[PDB]
Amino acid sequence: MELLQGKTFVVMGVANQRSIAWGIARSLHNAGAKLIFTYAGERLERNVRELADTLEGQESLVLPCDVTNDEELTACFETIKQEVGTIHGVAHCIAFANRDDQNISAFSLTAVAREAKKVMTEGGNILTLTYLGVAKASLEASVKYLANDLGQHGIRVNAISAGPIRTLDFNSILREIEERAPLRRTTTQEEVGDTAVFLFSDLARGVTGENIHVDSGYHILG
Amino acid sequence: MELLQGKTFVVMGVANQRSIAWGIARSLHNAGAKLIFTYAGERLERNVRELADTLEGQESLVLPCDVTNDEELTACFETIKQEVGTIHGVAHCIAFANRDDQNISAFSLTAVAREAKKVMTEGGNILTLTYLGVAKASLEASVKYLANDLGQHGIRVNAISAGPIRTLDFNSILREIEERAPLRRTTTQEEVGDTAVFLFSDLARGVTGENIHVDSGYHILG
Incomplete structure (x- = not known):
């Protein structure tokens, strides 16, 4: 367990193991953390239900939450103050639709943040992900400004600028x-998740x- | 223990508990890591000898190493391939003399790095510290370039830009x-050391x- 001991988080943007956020998800669970999951819609419900149970431990909530509309978020975060009391972070991880591009998160963090504020009474972290221009720039400022x-x-706000990963010219x-990356190799859901466990931990x-x-x-590089 | 399990590092720049590098030091030891320490000279020898034993566990080497001259470094890192075999990182932490300013580390990392290369056969990290212009800029490029x-x-190279800490107008x-810092409060040797344990860990x-x-x-801010 340990590091994320007695701690619990929301993980959004997860769809199909291959997804970057299941990567983050496992990496948090193994740190001994409890975790709510959300799904964008109809077809993304069963997949997120399927994956949450391939993880052992007291299974946690899998409530519906598409991010582009209020109630689904507002009531979704409403439930938490009413069912789990309080949480320790949020894992804004929308990285779908045209390679996460336009495309989202840019105008879904602020609301997402605002909502997190009320169910994060002791503090913690709101992670958001950048999967490798205008929307990188907004989101960049949005963080600074939410931070x-x-x-x-x-509440800490922090981003992960994550570089390309095996088939996720x-x-x-x-x-x-x-060939060029200092570490001469691409990244994995895992390097991305283990970074996260730090930002969410007490070390960060x-x-x-x-x-x-x-x-x-x-x-x-340039 | 754990996280830094069966791992060992050099910690330079340590002088008088108050020192930033003892901060880092404890934070690594508690992660279950072994650690060599170095000292700048005559008066800084006894202090570093004194502190290494206020830590329990198989006590580790406290060899002499001022950073501005080759042999003391070269032979100091020579000893390691000959006494401990291999290490997993280095903690370039010179932050003394006029508040670490001019003043050092800027032209002590490269050599320090070059030497680390030969006793870090499996990989790991070379941390260097910035305790909150020309020399911030060089050192900045030096990292990028060593990275x-x-x-x-x-070998990963990484820096910590560390903000002011309690009495270390x-x-x-x-x-x-x-009053202004997002977290409305100054930093500690501890926040600085726990960041380090990550960068040195397998998560980073x-x-x-x-x-x-x-x-x-x-x-x-600006």
Whole structure:
């Protein structure tokens, strides 16, 4: 267990193991953390129900929450103050539809954040993900700005700029990273999830408004 | 124990508990890690000898190493391939003399790195510290450049931009952070050390050439 001991989080954006957020999900569960999951709609319900039980432990809620509309979020986070009391972070992880692009998260964090505030009474972290222009820039500012607007209540906001991962020309991009990335290799759901367990942990209590690149060091290039 | 399990590191720049690097030091030991320590000279020898034994466990080497001259480094890292075999990281932490300013680390990392390469056969991390212009800029590039020059051998290079800590006008700066920093409060040797245990851990294996600010979110401001 340990590190995320007696702690519980929402994981959004999960759909089909291959998904980046199941990656994060496992990585948090193994740190001994409890976790609610959400689903975007009809077809994404069964998949998220299927995956939550391939994990052992007291199985946790799988409530419906598409992010582009209020009630589903508002009532979805309403339920938590009413069913689990309080949580310790949120894992804004929308990375679908045209490779996560336009496409989302950019205008789904603020609301998502605002809602998190009320069910995160002790503090913790609101992670959001960037899967490797205008919307990278907004979301960038949105974090900075949320970091500082929700600091004093104990909420940290932090991003992960995550580089390409095994089939989640293209065939070229992947090699290009095996060839240029400082670590000469692409990334995995796992490197991305283990970064997360830190940001959510007690070790990352001074790290707020940061943005950690899980990209083999690719960012340092041009 | 755990996280840094069966792992061992060099911690430089430690002098007088108050020192930032003893902070990092404890934070690594508690993660179950073995650690060599170095000292800048005559008076800094006894202090580093004194502190290494206030920590339990098989006590580890306290060899002499001032960083501005080769042999003391070269032979100091020579000893390791000859006495401990191999290590998993280095904690370049020079933060003394005029508040760590000019003043050092800027031209002590490269050599320090080069030497680390030979005693880090499996990989790991070379942390370097920035305790909150020209020398911040060099050191910044030095990392980027070392990150990418030592990537493929499994070495990650990473920095910590660390914000002011309790007495380590000034009286004003401290309040200014309690007042403006997103987390409305200054930092501790501890927030700085627990960040480190991550970068050195297996969780931070995709994080290379990053630079994590342990500054209550202060960096996001202007």
